[PDB]
Amino acid sequence: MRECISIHVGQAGVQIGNACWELYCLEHGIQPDGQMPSDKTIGGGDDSFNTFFSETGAGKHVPRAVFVDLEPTVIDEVRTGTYRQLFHPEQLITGKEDAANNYARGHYTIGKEIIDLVLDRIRKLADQCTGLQGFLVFHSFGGGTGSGFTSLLMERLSVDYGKKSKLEFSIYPAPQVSTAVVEPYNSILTTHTTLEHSDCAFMVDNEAIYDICRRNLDIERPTYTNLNRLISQIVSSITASLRFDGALNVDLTEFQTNLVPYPRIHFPLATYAPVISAEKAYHEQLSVAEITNACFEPANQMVKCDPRHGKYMACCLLYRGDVVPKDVNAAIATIKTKRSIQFVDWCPTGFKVGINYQPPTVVPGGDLAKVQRAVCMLSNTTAIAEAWARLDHKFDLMYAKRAFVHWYVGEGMEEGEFSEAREDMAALEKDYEEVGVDGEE
Amino acid sequence: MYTFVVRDENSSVYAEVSRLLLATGQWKRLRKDNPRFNLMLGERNRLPFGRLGHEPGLVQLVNYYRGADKLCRKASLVKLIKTSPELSESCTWFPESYVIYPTDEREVFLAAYNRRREGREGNVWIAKSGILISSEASELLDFIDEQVHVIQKYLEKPLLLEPGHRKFDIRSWVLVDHLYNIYLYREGVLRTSSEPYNSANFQDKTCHLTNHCIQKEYSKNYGRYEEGNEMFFEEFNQYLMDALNTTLENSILLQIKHIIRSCLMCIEPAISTKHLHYQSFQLFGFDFMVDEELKVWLIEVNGAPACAQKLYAELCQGIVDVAISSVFPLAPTSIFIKL
Amino acid sequence: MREIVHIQAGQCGNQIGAKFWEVISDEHGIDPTGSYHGDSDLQLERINVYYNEATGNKYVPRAILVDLEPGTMDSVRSGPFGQIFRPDNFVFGQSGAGNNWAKGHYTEGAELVDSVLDVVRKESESCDCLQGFQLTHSLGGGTGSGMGTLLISKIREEYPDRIMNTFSVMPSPKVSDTVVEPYNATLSVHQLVENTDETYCIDNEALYDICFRTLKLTTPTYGDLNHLVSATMSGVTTCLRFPGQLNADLRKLAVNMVPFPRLHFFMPGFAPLALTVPELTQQMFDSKNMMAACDPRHGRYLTVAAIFRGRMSMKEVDEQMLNVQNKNSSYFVEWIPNNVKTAVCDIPPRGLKMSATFIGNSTAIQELFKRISEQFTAMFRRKAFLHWYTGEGMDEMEFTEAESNMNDLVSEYQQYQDA
Amino acid sequence: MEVIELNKCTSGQSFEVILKPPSDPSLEEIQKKLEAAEERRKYQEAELLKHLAE
Ligand SMILES: Nc1nc2c(ncn2[C@@H]2O[C@H](COP(=O)(O)OP(=O)(O)OP(=O)(O)O)[C@@H](O)[C@H]2O)c(=O)[nH]1
Ligand SMILES: Nc1ncnc2c1ncn2[C@@H]1O[C@H](COP(=O)(O)OP(=O)(O)CP(=O)(O)O)[C@@H](O)[C@H]1O
Ligand SMILES: Nc1nc2c(ncn2[C@@H]2O[C@H](COP(=O)(O)OP(=O)(O)O)[C@@H](O)[C@H]2O)c(=O)[nH]1
Ligand SMILES: [Mg+2]
Numbered sequence A: 001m002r003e004c005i006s007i008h009v010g011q012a013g014v015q016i017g018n019a020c021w022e023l024y025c026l027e028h029g030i031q032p033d034g035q036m037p038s039d040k041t042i043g044g045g046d047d048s049f050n051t052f053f054s055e056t057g058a059g060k061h062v063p064r065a066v067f068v069d070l071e072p073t074v075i076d077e078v079r080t081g082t083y084r085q086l087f088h089p090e091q092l093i094t095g096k097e098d099a100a101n102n103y104a105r106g107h108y109t110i111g112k113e114i115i116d117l118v119l120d121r122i123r124k125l126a127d128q129c130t131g132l133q134g135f136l137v138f139h140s141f142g143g144g145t146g147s148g149f150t151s152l153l154m155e156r157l158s159v160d161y162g163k164k165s166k167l168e169f170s171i172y173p174a175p176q177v178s179t180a181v182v183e184p185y186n187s188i189l190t191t192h193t194t195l196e197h198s199d200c201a202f203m204v205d206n207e208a209i210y211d212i213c214r215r216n217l218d219i220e221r222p223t224y225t226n227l228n229r230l231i232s233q234i235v236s237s238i239t240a241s242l243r244f245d246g247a248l249n250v251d252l253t254e255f256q257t258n259l260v261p262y263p264r265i266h267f268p269l270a271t272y273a274p275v276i277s278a279e280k281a282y283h284e285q286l287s288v289a290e291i292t293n294a295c296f297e298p299a300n301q302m303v304k305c306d307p308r309h310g311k312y313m314a315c316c317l318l319y320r321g322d323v324v325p326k327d328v329n330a331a332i333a334t335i336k337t338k339r340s341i342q343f344v345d346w347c348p349t350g351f352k353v354g355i356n357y358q359p360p361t362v363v364p365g366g367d368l369a370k371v372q373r374a375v376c377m378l379s380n381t382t383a384i385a386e387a388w389a390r391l392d393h394k395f396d397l398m399y400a401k402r403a404f405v406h407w408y409v410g411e412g413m414e415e416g417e418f419s420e421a422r423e424d425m426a427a428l429e430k431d432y433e434e435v436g437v438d439g440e441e
Numbered sequence B: 001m002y003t004f005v006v007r008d009e010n011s012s013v014y015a016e017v018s019r020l021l022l023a024t025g026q027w028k029r030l031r032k033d034n035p036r037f038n039l040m041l042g043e044r045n046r047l048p049f050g051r052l053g054h055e056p057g058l059v060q061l062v063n064y065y066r067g068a069d070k071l072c073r074k075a076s077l078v079k080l081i082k083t084s085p086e087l088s089e090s091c092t093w094f095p096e097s098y099v100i101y102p103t104d105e106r107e108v109f110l111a112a113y114n115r116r117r118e119g120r121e122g123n124v125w126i127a128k129s130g131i132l133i134s135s136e137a138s139e140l141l142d143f144i145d146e147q148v149h150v151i152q153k154y155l156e157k158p159l160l161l162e163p164g165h166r167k168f169d170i171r172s173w174v175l176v177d178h179l180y181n182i183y184l185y186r187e188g189v190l191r192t193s194s195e196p197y198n199s200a201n202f203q204d205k206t207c208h209l210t211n212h213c214i215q216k217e218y219s220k221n222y223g224r225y226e227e228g229n230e231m232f233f234e235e236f237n238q239y240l241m242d243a244l245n246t247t248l249e250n251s252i253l254l255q256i257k258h259i260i261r262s263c264l265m266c267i268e269p270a271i272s273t274k275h276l277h278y279q280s281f282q283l284f285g286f287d288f289m290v291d292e293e294l295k296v297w298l299i300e301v302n303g304a305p306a307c308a309q310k311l312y313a314e315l316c317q318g319i320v321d322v323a324i325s326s327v328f329p330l331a332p333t334s335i336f337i338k339l
Numbered sequence C: 001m002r003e004i005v006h007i008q009a010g011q012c013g014n015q016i017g018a019k020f021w022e023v024i025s026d027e028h029g030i031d032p033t034g035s036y037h038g039d040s041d042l043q044l045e046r047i048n049v050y051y052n053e054a055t056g057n058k059y060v061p062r063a064i065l066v067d068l069e070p071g072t073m074d075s076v077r078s079g080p081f082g083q084i085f086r087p088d089n090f091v092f093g094q095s096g097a098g099n100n101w102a103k104g105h106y107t108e109g110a111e112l113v114d115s116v117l118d119v120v121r122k123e124s125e126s127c128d129c130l131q132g133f134q135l136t137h138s139l140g141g142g143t144g145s146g147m148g149t150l151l152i153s154k155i156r157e158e159y160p161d162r163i164m165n166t167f168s169v170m171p172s173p174k175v176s177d178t179v180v181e182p183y184n185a186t187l188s189v190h191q192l193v194e195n196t197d198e199t200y201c202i203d204n205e206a207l208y209d210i211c212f213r214t215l216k217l218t219t220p221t222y223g224d225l226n227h228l229v230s231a232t233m234s235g236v237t238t239c240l241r242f243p244g245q246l247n248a249d250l251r252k253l254a255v256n257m258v259p260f261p262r263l264h265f266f267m268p269g270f271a272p273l274a275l276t277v278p279e280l281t282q283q284m285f286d287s288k289n290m291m292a293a294c295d296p297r298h299g300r301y302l303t304v305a306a307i308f309r310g311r312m313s314m315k316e317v318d319e320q321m322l323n324v325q326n327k328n329s330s331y332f333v334e335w336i337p338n339n340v341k342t343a344v345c346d347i348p349p350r351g352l353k354m355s356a357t358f359i360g361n362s363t364a365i366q367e368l369f370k371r372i373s374e375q376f377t378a379m380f381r382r383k384a385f386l387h388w389y390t391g392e393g394m395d396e397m398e399f400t401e402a403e404s405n406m407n408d409l410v411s412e413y414q415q416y417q418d419a
Numbered sequence D: 001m002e003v004i005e006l007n008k009c010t011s012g013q014s015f016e017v018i019l020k021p022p023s024d025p026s027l028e029e030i031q032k033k034l035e036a037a038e039e040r041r042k043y044q045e046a047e048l049l050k051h052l053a054e
């Protein structure tokens, strides 16, 4: 058994981590007090769920998690909420004043003074691991802490844990729920300095989660709570293989091997189905073919983009519930004909399939309906480059006038870091172009 | 007040569309790089489709279908027809074509060639992408080697109009709206050659190539039989009745409509914007050849076509009604044929 | 706990400040004696941003009252909520400033400033994590303008990494006390360009017109003008005083409102001056609802922040907001994507079921500075009334530099209005 | 459409279908970058205090 440590940085990272661990407990039968009546090994055992939960001698199952935020409001609700009893104070770290949506403030000014403390608390958790796999890092792109302190932490983690995989769950900025106008700056800055330190990152565009909440859940103005419960469902199906018995994606390294052949191109596209409103008393239970076909509709993707015009480098299907292999094979055969799925010539045209028999768990009182089968497709398609293009274009519009740059230089960052970060993104966009693409008449 | 942007100054069609839009009081033109638009009249090349449909609260529409180039590039069209099961290499209305680079078809082309000039059969081909019509394969492959090209069987038995003994091509305008309805403009145009068709001299290409480009710089009888070497359907229909005792609808238009449907339906799964975060429509220019048996042959599909000076007003207004106002209403009678 | 230290200086600064504390004290459920009598936990949620807590759970405004003569201070102490302020936070002299920037900044003001900083230092010491400061004052007089900017300069020297915000009342010939107001205002604007992060420009001419034309007040008083300002001050600080995610604190608001350090002068607006969401949206964006006496149609918005208060359709808010900008889209710069942000507070202001407050960083604000510059040069060209200032030790050179500085500011706005 | 690597357990199973075969900065370097930025902040703040002293 090998342990995974989760790190939640910033308001987005902390509040998403909240929804996940709440869901993890419901999936594993762990009560808010940390007691797990099904674990017959009191205060011990190296089961699959122990990758994410340690056990005290009193039978408490404690998440292998550290929450960090440069301002205490968000983490104070963890200390005072339903699962307050779950974590101990050492794993909840809060600063005094935040990064003011300023990458340079989170990375340099404030990060320099708190980084050593965060690493010390992580080492405390690492010291409880007989075989640590690596880390799962949740954070936003646009926040000053989520962007600035995350990239500093990732640099230090590569130092203190050289032979450990690092995976990301990154919230891509969307104006529909965006706070700041400088989020394009922070996204490019944090992607540049984090790129060589992340083995595999799952971007979630708030614009996609927002529309899914409005279309499928009939929520006229979704809140962060609605968004985060849906996000935690996707995160759960992505990490289910690590904390349940199985043979697919049982190790963090496997995510890289199965989804990332080209190291810089480590941003798989996630597509989830079905998302059904709980207010619907009786809803038609979708079949394996129907939900598998839904993995190729743009409206169910975590990042709005058109895979029909990219190329696939790897595709992985993760099922939960009443699913059997022959149903999956039949569905794929039907889809490979209709829809256009072009794989790169230097990669096999196949699908790795994982099935977990436990149906997806839903938080009581949530917006999602209980379904008998769900699926999450992880596909590394070049179509996700559209997200970099959009982001890079907003960066260019503001940087041509040096708008807001003084806030970053004022915190000790050099103006050169902007262009250095931007040129790395230009090369990243070209890497996708190379792998992907082939008047007045 | 609806907003739109213009990113193709050269489009004579959407220059008129932009002119009609402003002439309603409910559309305002923004700067080319203003992202808060309802309608983009995009550039021909490298249209940033990835930046569409991401503005909060804006339903955005673009006048191009991302991926339609597969049908409008001579090289890719051949590959699409031979590859698509909906069309197959047995497709009877597309001339035998081969893609040859200066994955390559240069080999298979010479195989079917030997079977022609050996069997006394007419063996004339036309390479294009700078056009060349040759009798032996030798001179053809040399022209390409000296950009990718396509060698296509030359229709040696074209339908020749009388008087004149001259070949022509038919242009049909097709509008595909955001719901992927296929609309055929009721008005087509015949681009005719003013010179008699010569079956032996392939050096002079003034009577073999009918496009308005050559029928002006090198046409010796421009405007003799019809103004601007452009015969419209009414005249052509009356001719088919007088000369051949048949109608344009029966002898030709049925095949044209079948070919339009086949090409666009084939690619609908790849380019449809039904469940997409933005919407597309596009005007297409189909070019057809008619042989002496009254069989219609598809030549090419143009993705940014121009219109006949005499038909701009009706077609451009029809575009605004079917494509623009359908999505963005304003405060019957129909010029299209729904396929 | 992110505390803000409030300072009000001079006649205008103290009369507007007094009404401000009166309005928000009512909103947070604080009576004139500092005792809480509310009925919603949302009131005490962020009460400490503006109020200290004493035994008996009495809340005391974190406010410092400054003036160079006792008159206004005595009127506040005898005012409606005068008992709510800490007695030792009244800092005043007896000489007066004679509507003279030099007296407030260099002579009379210099004698009082250290004791003001003593009080400021005391309020800051008891702050868990000081956000920054907000100053209310006028620019046309002597104390608020001359000593107010002296205070800002001293505060910045001692707290160089804290946010400094001001509500600054700009003079107008139509609502004028003395002819030297353009002199005092021109001198102050330069201090603000260098030492404030955010300045809400409140033009007395716009306040008058609003009381005259819109509100149908035949003969408006300073009291009527101060009704509009305190209502505006309450709205612009709503996202600071209640649970909020956008413009949460002073530094985050600055980072998203100020793309260039010198261009940090904002036009505020309010509505109504019940209404539907489209009505609030349309009115809040009309010039007749803005208090900088500048037509936004003459310039372009760099950034905009809108705060909606009360129970209303969150979808209608976005639709109207996204509507109002996607119609007259010529007035938003295209090189700051998504530069219009919207916040919503459930608690409406007293006497209204829903209102909307508008904060714009518009290049049209240059019209205000140009008016002041023109009035400055009409007198300075003849050295009129300069002896009042040279008698306090100032030289003409300092006037010439302040003139060029504000003209530099105007031309800086003109560059970004063309871009 | 081959199917390979079928693993079955009590809580699920996994397999693979193939439709067609194919055709850093050190600790001291980070510390320097952080102290460099801090130094530029202290320089800018010194120029401010110098400006205010004048
Ligand atoms: N999906 C989701 N997105 C969030 C959440 N909280 C914030 N965001 C997004 O994150 C971005 C803002 O960054 P934050 O994470 O709030 O800021 P931070 O990491 O705390 O950094 P600072 O506050 O600047 O110190 C915006 O794009 C928000 O939409 C959340 O709970 N869920
Ligand atoms: N296989 C074939 N048989 C006979 N004629 C042919 C032919 N292929 C092309 N042509 C002639 O060539 C002319 C136009 O050729 P083509 O359309 O391929 O060039 P092009 O694409 O530059 C015209 P446009 O600019 O309108 O798209 C037509 O008038 C047609 O008569
Ligand atoms: N809106 C408003 N403006 C005022 C008020 N009192 C004075 N002013 C304006 O402020 C300027 C005079 O400055 P004042 O505050 O009286 O001088 P000070 O006491 O030395 O700071 C003139 O432009 C007046 O129009 C007031 O109560 N409300
Ligand atoms: Mg935060």
Ligand SMILES: [Mg+2]
Pocket: A441, B300, B301, B302
């Ligand atoms: Mg062509």
Ligand SMILES: [Mg+2]
Pocket: C011, C012, C141, C177
């Ligand atoms: Mg006075």
